[model samples]
Structure formats: structure tokens, C-alpha cells
Target: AIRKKLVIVGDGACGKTCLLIVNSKDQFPEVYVPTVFENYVADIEVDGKQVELALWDTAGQEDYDRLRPLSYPDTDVILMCFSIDSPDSLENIPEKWTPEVKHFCPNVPIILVGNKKDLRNDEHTRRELAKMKQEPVKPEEGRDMANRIGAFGYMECSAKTKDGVREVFEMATRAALQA
Candidate 1:
């Protein structure tokens, strides 16, 4: 069996864990908790070839900036993530997430993931955004962000809906296999 490494980086509460947990654990975590450091394994088949995927999670807080790179060295791909509900989270991607990932894993394939996809249409999130003079991230913007960072692809998925989750990794696996 082939093996691949993936490390996800994003602002705290951007649904990194939710995406991983839902795929690996087959369960969605309703309550949010910040990850210090966590890893998971998922046996996946891409293009009919099986791969043992090692999924690495990181803390997005300022305190663990030193520890985050421990997850990067052997990484075959990077999931640079942001939440659709939070405009600032997306803003941090070009400035914070992409810069850090590029510095540590320059040649690794980066896939931009806009998590919490379902939130983009929710009344409360939209209302709150309007109050704050912000809006949910659009698919167009997500694609543009990926293009700006030279990412392999941009994906919008909701762990809650189990939508587009598998496609994201299918693309990642293809990226890894090629690299």
C-alpha cells in the first residue's frame, strides 16, 4: 500500500478538526474545541488505488507556532483552510496560512479548503455578517484565493453536510501520487 502525508493549517475554529473527524471517525463534532496537536489515519482509495493517509492537525494559536512545523516536514500535501462563516479567517489564509505553509513546505501541493460550507446560507451567519459589514465567502473568491496561492485546487465542503468532503481528498491523493 502507498502512504501519503497531509497537514492542515488554518485559523482556530476554521473546522479543520470537523472535516478530519467526520471523514475519519464517521461522526461530526457538534461542539468546537481547539486542537493542540492531533493526527488521524484514513484508509482511502483514489482512482482505485488504496492509500494509507496520515492526517496531521495543528494548533492555529500564536502559542504553538513553533510546534506546528513538526507536522510539515514529511507532508505530501497541505490543506490550507478557512471557514465560510468568518471573513477574517479567509483573510488570514493569504497572509498567515499560505505564507507559513509555503515557507515550510514549498513544493508540496496546497489545496485551499473553505470549510463550514453550509454556514454560507444560514440566516444567522448572514445577519451577523451584515451587522459586521462582511459576507460569507463565495466559491468564486475561494477559487481566486487558490489561484493567488498557486494551489492545486479550491474546495468548499461542509463537515456537517458531508458534502464534497471525499472529493477534496480524492484531489489531494491525486496531488500526492503525482508529487
Candidate 2:
């Protein structure tokens, strides 16, 4: 049984902890601070093959950067999380963190995740009100970014409502296993 380690990395408050809580305990806590240094592991079976996942939830702030070595040990998969509501989170990824990770873990399977997708349409509502336009951002833009980054796929999720949550991990798992 090959153990797969999946590291979730993103900027602060992009739903890293919320995602972990939703997947590990099915309890979405309302309050979460950026992780100082934390990791969570769970066992799962894919294709009738027993597999265990070591999910490392890292601190999302730049100050916590030094601890990255501790967070990304022997990673097999990486989930780059972003918030649909925060355009900055969505846009700054290629410049900020993606390059560093690629330099370090070039061959690990990667999946780009857009968490808080329940905020998808609602966020668009707010944007519409602000911009006086009705159309929300398309999921295709996110998919395109994922492809450009060489990610296996893209996931849209909301941890609290559990929307798209399972698909996030399941898709990542399937991709990792196939690799």
C-alpha cells in the first residue's frame, strides 16, 4: 500500500482548515486561524485498494514560510486552494507560490481547488451589485488556470455546506492513484 501525502497550500483564510475539518471530522468550525504548523491523516480505499492519505494543512501566511520544509515532507499530491470570492487569492497564485512548489516537487500530482463555491453565485451577486452586471465568474476560467498550471483537474467546493467537498478529495485521490 503506497501512502499518499497531500499538502494543501494557499493564502490565509482560503478555507484550508475548513476543508480539513469537513473531510476529516465532517465538522466545519466557524472560527479558524491560520495554521502555525499542522498535519492530518486519514485512511481511504480507492478501487478496492487500501490507501492512507497524509494530509498536511499548512499555515497560509508568509510569516509561516519557514515551516514549509516541515509541512511538505515527501509529498505525493498537492491541492492548491483558492477562494472564488477573493479574486486576489485566485489571481496571485501563479506569481506567489506556484513557482516555488514546482521547483521543489516537480513531479507530484497537483489539483487546483476553488473552495467556498457555495459563494460562487452569491459572490457573483455581490460583484453584480457593485458592477451593475448580472453574470458570475465562469468555472471555466478556473479550469483553464488549472490546465495551464499542469494540474490534474479543478474542484469547486464549500466546506460548510459540503458542496463539491468530496469531489475535491476523491478527484485528487483518483488522480494520484492513477499516477
Candidate 3:
């Protein structure tokens, strides 16, 4: 079996953990909890062959900033994710996550992901964001950021809805193979 490692980073509550869980275990969570770095493995098939994929979930809070990069060594690809419902989270892609990932894994290809795709059209989320004079991060904004950061690709997914989750990992595996 081929072995590949993937490390994911994003701001808190940006759905990184959920994305990993849903894709690897087929379990959709019903609650939200903070992550303090977790690792999961998924034996998946890519292009008619079996792949042992290492999925690393790192804490996104500033409290763990110093320790997070410890998970970066030997990573095959970095999935830099942000919540589509939170514009601030998307903004941090360039200001925070991208710089850190690039510094630690300079040669690793990044796949920029926009999580919470289901919320982009949710009425309740729209109202809540409007109260704060904000809106969901658009897909175009994500693609542009991916380009600026030299990401391998841009993808959007909803862990709760399980949409595009498989595609994210498949793309990551392909990038890993190339790396």
C-alpha cells in the first residue's frame, strides 16, 4: 500500500475536524467542539490502487500556534481551510494560515478548501451575518486566494451535508502522489 500524509489548518470553527471525520469515517457530527490536534487514517483507493492516507487535524487557536507546526513534518499536502460563512476566517487564509504552512512546508502543495458550503445559502446564517454587517465568503474569493497562495486547487465542501467531501481527499491524494 502507498502511504501519504495530509495536514489540515484553518481558524477555529472553520470545520476542519468535521471535514476529516466525515470523510474518513462516514460520520457526520451533530455538535461542535474544539480540536487539539488529532490524527486519522483512511484506506482509500485512488486510480485503482489502495492508498493509506494519514489525516492530521491541527488546532487553529492562537493558544496552540507554537505547537501546531510540529505536525507538519513529512506532510504530503496541506489543506488550508476556512469557513465559507465567516468572512474573517477566509481573510485569515492569507494573513495567517498560508504563511505558517508555507514556512513550515515550503515545498508542499496546498489545497485551499472552503468549508460549511451548506451555509452560504442558509437564511438563518445570512441574517446572523447581516447583523454584523458581514456575509459569507464567495467561491470566487476562495479561488482567487488559492491562486495567490499557489494552492494546487480550490474546493468547497459541507461536512454536515457530506457534499464534495470525497473530492477533497481524492484531490489531496493526487497532490500527495505528485509530491
Candidate 4:
């Protein structure tokens, strides 16, 4: 079967590599590990759709930003991920990474992911910390972002436990194929 290129894009140290490693080998890497430049690709059948996912670990450092130019049109699918453990990393993803890529690959299949869901209980609280006016206020934000950007889907997954990790790709690929 032919391979469909899927790119993983996000800020550094946000567990992008960890997710790739987990998805590719079903193993998680150290949280403190540094990722300057690395890439991984795998062929997987999700919901019966065969796809080749090209996972690119882009440099979070400004100097390495130029390398991103090398990964543009080759990407058939884009996985935009961020760690919910760190608010900054999570913020940068929706605020910068997703928008930037949308300009370049407007119609490409895109998936927005919130990683480290296992850490969610430890980092933040679901209620009483912030006002939640809607029925599903917490997750509603993520869904809203996906809708605004025309994302295929939004998922919160934990690489450490493999929770929602593989499922994210499953639903995203299904959506991609249907799109």
C-alpha cells in the first residue's frame, strides 16, 4: 500500500517525541530528554485506512526553526500536540503552531492533541478553580478550537499509559479518510 505522510508538529519538550515513540513502539521516553532534531515514520492501519505517519520532532529553539521549512508539502497529515501538564506548552500549540501550519497546509488533515492527560489531575482542577458555565465546559474549549480551525478532531491522550493515544490516531485517520 502507498504511504500517506503525516507530520507531527508542536513546541519542544511538550512530549511530541514521547508520543511518537509511544505510538511507534508503545514505549514512553523520559520527560527531561532533549529533542533537537529527530524524525520517525510508521505505517499503520487505523479503522482500515492504511497510512504512513511522518513524525517530525522540530526544534523548540529559534535557531532550528529554519529546519521546519524542509517539512512542508511532504506532510499529508499533521498532528499538532502539546502537553497539558505545562500551561505554557499547551498555550503555544493553539496560539502559534496550529495557526502557522494552517496557513501553509490549509486543507491538509489536521489533528489537535492534548497530551499528558495522566498529569491533568495533578496539574489542575476540574471544578471550583475556574468558572465553568457549560455542561462540558472543560472539554468544550478544546472542541471549540478544533471547530474554529476546521480540525478533523481533538483528543486528550496520555502517552505514559497509552490512554487515548492510539485512539486519537484511530478516529483522526477515520476522519481524514472520510474527509
In order, what lDDT does every prediction score? 0.87, 0.76, 0.89, 0.67
Q: Count the backbone clashes (under 3 Å) in each candidate.
A: 0, 0, 0, 0
The TM-scores of all predictions, comma-separated, are 0.93, 0.86, 0.93, 0.76
Predicted candidate 3 versus true structure: per-residue lDDT over 1-179, tens digit per residue: 99998999999889988888888765544665565244678787888989999888889889999888889999998999999999999889999998899999989999999999999999999999999999999989999999998999999999889999999999998898885
Q: What would the per-residue lDDT of candidate 2 be over residues 13-49, giving only the tens digit for each residue?
A: 8888788777887544466556524456666777788
- Using lDDT as the measure, which candidate wins? 3
Put the candidates in TM-score order, highest first. 3, 1, 2, 4
Q: Write the per-residue lDDT of candidate 1 for residues 1-179, one digit (tens) a residue.
A: 89999888999888887788878875544666565245578788877899988988888777888888877888898888999999899899999988899899988999999999999999999999999799999999999999998999999999889999998888888888887
Kindly report the root-mean-square deviation of model 1 from the true structure over all alpha carbons: 1.8
lDDT of 2 at 163: 86
- Candidate 3 runs further than 4 Å off: 27-33, 36-39
lDDT of 3 at 42: 75
Q: Tell me the lDDT of model 3 at 107.
A: 90
Better of 3 and 4 by TM-score: 3
Evaluate residue 52 in candidate 1 and report its C-alpha lDDT on the 0 to 100 scale.
Answer: 85
- Tell me how candidate 2 scores on lDDT: 0.76
Summarize candidate 4's per-residue lDDT along 113-163 as a digit string, tens digits.
887777667524334233443121245666777787678888898877889
